[PDB]
C-alpha cells in the first residue's frame, strides 16, 4: 500500500518518528507485512482548504485491495486520528482519497504485481 | 473537491490571491460548496512537456460528482485561461487529469462520505 | 501520456538530460509522439519505503489507452531500469501506479481529449 500527506504545516512540526509511526499502524491497519507499505509526506505546501490557509491535509491511500466502505471509513478514523494529534489538522479539514489499485496496474521491481 | 497544480514557473510568478481565485472559480465552475473545495499550488517544479522545460502545468481535479465529458470541457477552458491569464502558461502545455470519486472512496472528518 | 516520479533522492543526483530521456524512451514505449509525452521528477523528498529511507520512487504513468497487463510489465521493466542506472534506486523500492485515462476526464488546450 502507497500512502501520501500533502499539507500546509511547517516542516518542524511533522515529528522525529512520523513516518515510521504511519508506517507501522497500516501496516496493522490493512494487514499487510510493513515490508510493501510505502509513506510520503509533503509539509510547507501552498494550500488551502475552504479557501482557508489553517492547517490542512490532502492525502492518498492505494492498496491492492483492502480498500471498501468499512475499511476506508477505519482508515480515516485513524489516519484523521494520527494527522490531528501528530500534526494538529482538524479532521474535518483532512480529504483521503482511496484507490482500489488492479495488480496489473501497479508496477514493482521490473514488473506489476498481477 | 480537490484541485492540484504542479508547475515549473517560479514560486515568484504565482500571484498574491490566486488560491482564493482558483477556489472561487471551482465552486462556481462546479456548483459546489466553496468549503469542501480544496486547492493547491505546486511551483519551482522539474518537468517537461512535449520535451521542453519552457512554461507548464500537470494538474488534477477530484470531486464527488460533477465530472463528466461537458462539464470537464468547461472546467478545462476555465482553468487553462487562469493558468494562462495568472501564470503565463500556454493551454497547450497543460495537462488536467479529472477523476468522479466515489463518496465511499473519499476520507473527511474521521469517516468517509458514505 | 504523463509520469511523475517522487524519490528522496537529492535533486544533485538527477542527472543532465534526464528528463529528456525520460521522454524519449516513454514516447518509445507507449508508441505516443514525444510532443504529448509530459514528464516531471520531484527529489528531496520525505519518504519511507518498507519502514525506512534507502533510496526508493513513488511513481505513476497515466495514458489514454496503451495500458494493460503486458504493456505495464514491459514499462515496469523500462522506467524500474532507468531509475537503477540513474537514480540508483533499488527496483524492489519503486512502485509504479498505472491508470488507463478515458479521453474525456483530460483536459488539455482548453477543453478535453475526447
Ligand atoms: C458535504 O456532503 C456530505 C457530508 C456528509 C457528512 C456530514 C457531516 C459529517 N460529520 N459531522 C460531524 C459533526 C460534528 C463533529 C464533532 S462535534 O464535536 O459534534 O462538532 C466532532 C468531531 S471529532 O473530530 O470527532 O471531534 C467530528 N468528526 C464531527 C463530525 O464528523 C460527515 O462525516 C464523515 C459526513 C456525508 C455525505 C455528504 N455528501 N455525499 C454525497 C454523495 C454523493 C454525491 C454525488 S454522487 O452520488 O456520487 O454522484 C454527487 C454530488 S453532486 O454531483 O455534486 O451534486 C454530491 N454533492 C454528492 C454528495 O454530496
Ligand atoms: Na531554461
Ligand atoms: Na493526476
Ligand atoms: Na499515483
Known amino acids: 500500500p502507497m500512502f501520501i500527506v500533502n499539507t500546509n504545516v511547517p516542516r518542524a512540526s511533522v515529528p522525529d518518528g512520523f513516518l515510521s509511526e504511519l508506517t507501522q499502524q497500516l501496516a496493522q491497519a490493512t494487514g499487510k507485512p510493513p515490508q510493501y507499505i510505502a509513506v510520503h509526506v509533503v509539509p510547507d505546501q501552498l494550500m488551502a482548504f475552504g479557501g482557508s490557509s489553517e492547517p490542512c491535509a490532502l492525502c492518498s491511500l492505494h492498496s491492492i485491495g483492502k480498500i471498501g466502505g ?5 482508515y480515516s478514523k485513524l489516519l484523521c ?5 501528530r500534526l494538529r489538522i482538524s479532521p474535518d479539514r483532512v480529504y483521503i482519497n482511496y484507490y482500489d489499485m488492479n495488480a496489473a ?3 514493482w521491481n521490473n514488473s506489476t504485481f498481477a
Chains 1, 2, 3 share one sequence.
Do not use: K, P, T
Request: without cysteine; proline residues 0%; glycine residues 16%.
Open 70 to 74: 468499512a475499511q476506508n471509513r477505519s
Open 81 to 85: 486520528g494520527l494527522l490531528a494529534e
Open 105 to 107: 496496474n501497479v508496477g
